[PDB]
Amino acid sequence: GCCSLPPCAANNPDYC
């Protein structure tokens, strides 16, 4: 999922 994936977490600080 997003929050455990570096590129995704960094691009979605609002969610993660």
Produce one character per residue of 1-16: b if its CB has 16 or more CB atoms within 10 Å, e if not.
eeeeeeeeeeeeeeee
Distances in whole angstroms, Cα of residue 5 to Cα of each of 2, 13, 14: 5, 12, 15
Method: X-ray
Structure tokens, 2: 């997003």
Structure tokens, 14: 């609002």
